[PDB]
Design a protein around this ligand. Structure first.
Ligand SMILES: [Ca+2]
Ligand SMILES: [Mg+2]
Length: 142
């Protein structure tokens, strides 16, 4: 299983090549942060708990949690498709960088870990990459 994720910050797409740059003017009423999640290799029609976390990337490189959202979502045909996670309006700081992490965990046991053909473990897929610019936004200075 894989999650391939792109952030939208006040309407600005992140990409692997360029963080989502939020204009100073757009930062004044906060920053609307939405994540888009393309998943593959999940179990078709199974329910997952998707947890997204918005992390402040501090000048020293460490991370601080700003917001966390959970949503009940369902894997589509052949266990691939698209989900969304809306952080809503976040009061982010001018000049600062933020990154979105995602974690998908099946509601049901979908994996046999003890060779008894009884499914006993949830499927877990994570994208927790502070160096992924597609999941990163920066609030521009004036
Ligand atoms: Ca705004
Ligand atoms: Mg088992």
């Amino acid at each position: 299983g894989t999650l391939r994720c792109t952030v939208i910050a006040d309407g600005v797409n992140g990409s692997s090549e360029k963080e989502a740059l939020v204009s100073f003017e757009n930062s004044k009423d906060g920053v609307d942060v939405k994540d888009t999640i393309n998943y593959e290799g999940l179990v078709a029609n199974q329910n997952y708990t998707l947890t997204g976390t918005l992390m402040h990337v501090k000048a020293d490189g460490s991370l601080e949690e700003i917001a966390t959202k959970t949503t009940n979502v369902t894997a589509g045909e052949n266990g691939n498709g698209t989900w969304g996670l809306d952080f809503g309006n976040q009061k982010l700081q001018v000049g600062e960088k933020y990154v979105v992490f995602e974690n998908a965990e099946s509601v049901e046991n979908l994996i046999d870990t003890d060779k008894d053909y009884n499914l006993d473990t949830k499927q877990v897929v994570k994208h927790e990459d502070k160096n992924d610019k597609a999941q990163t936004l920066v609030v521009e200075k004036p």
